[PDB]
Nucleic acid binder design. Structure first.
Length: 191
RNA sequence: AUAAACCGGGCUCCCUGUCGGUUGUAAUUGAUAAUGUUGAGAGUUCCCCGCGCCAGCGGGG
């Protein structure tokens, strides 16, 4: 039930695209992160939960850092923040084809607010109950030796805890696809 | 293989010493950038793997 929480910046040099953000992060030490200021002159402000202590490098400067244990009392309401990409997985309507030889599957984003909220309450399950949520819409992110696109949503709001351990390893494992591209990290805060 | 052939114009040498370009000088008065406008709609998001009851669900990029 332990972790390392850090405030990390990545020089705008490498931070030009997601792939190099995740790279720059890897070279500090798995882990999870939330982008807080994507493109400043100094570079890119990122919050970082991890299992290992980070050590500042030429590309990714560690501002401040501290180690944390989780003690959450069930029944207590909390503020939360989560950046993630709600999806549905279907079979291609373009009827494109897989490598093995039958048709491809595609992850499409959920584009209705109700569906997104639903997706949230679903994924956190009986760990907590969302009491108040606002599903912040974000501009799509692309990435470039692979290449594609992911559509994120940023939930902020108020949950009530129902099962502390469950919730805790939700926090430590992450919620939703695309963990290595800014998603997953759930941050909690006292009411 | 020609008024041709063979066939050096060649040796020595400070241009040197002296020298304020200097005093004086508002660029200054006048001047709306102003009228008019849903961002709406839309689940395609590219690769690997697991589970699938083929509705999809999940892990990793």
């Amino acid at each position: 039930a332990w972790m390392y929480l850090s405030k990390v910046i990545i020089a705008r040099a490498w931070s030009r695209d997601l792939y190099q953000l995740h790279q720059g992060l890897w070279h500090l030490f798995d882990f999870l992160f939330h982008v807080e200021k994507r493109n400043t002159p100094e570079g890119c402000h990122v919050l970082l939960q991890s299992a290992q202590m980070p050590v500042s490098t030429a590309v990714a400067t560690v501002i401040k850092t501290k180690q944390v244990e989780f003690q959450l009392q069930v029944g207590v309401p909390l503020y939360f923040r989560l950046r993630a990409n709600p999806i549905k997985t279907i079979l291609d309507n373009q009827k494109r084809l897989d490598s093995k030889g039958n048709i491809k599957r595609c992850r499409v984003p959920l584009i209705k607010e109700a569906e997104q909220i639903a997706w949230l309450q679903r994924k956190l399950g009986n760990a907590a109950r969302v009491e108040d949520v606002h599903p912040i819409s974000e501009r799509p992110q692309y990435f470039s030796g692979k290449s594609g696109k992911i559509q994120t949503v940023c939930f902020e709001g108020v949950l009530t805890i129902n099962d502390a351990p469950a919730l805790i390893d939700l926090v430590q494992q992450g919620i939703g696809p695309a963990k290595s591209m800014g998603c997953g990290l759930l941050s909690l805060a006292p009411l």
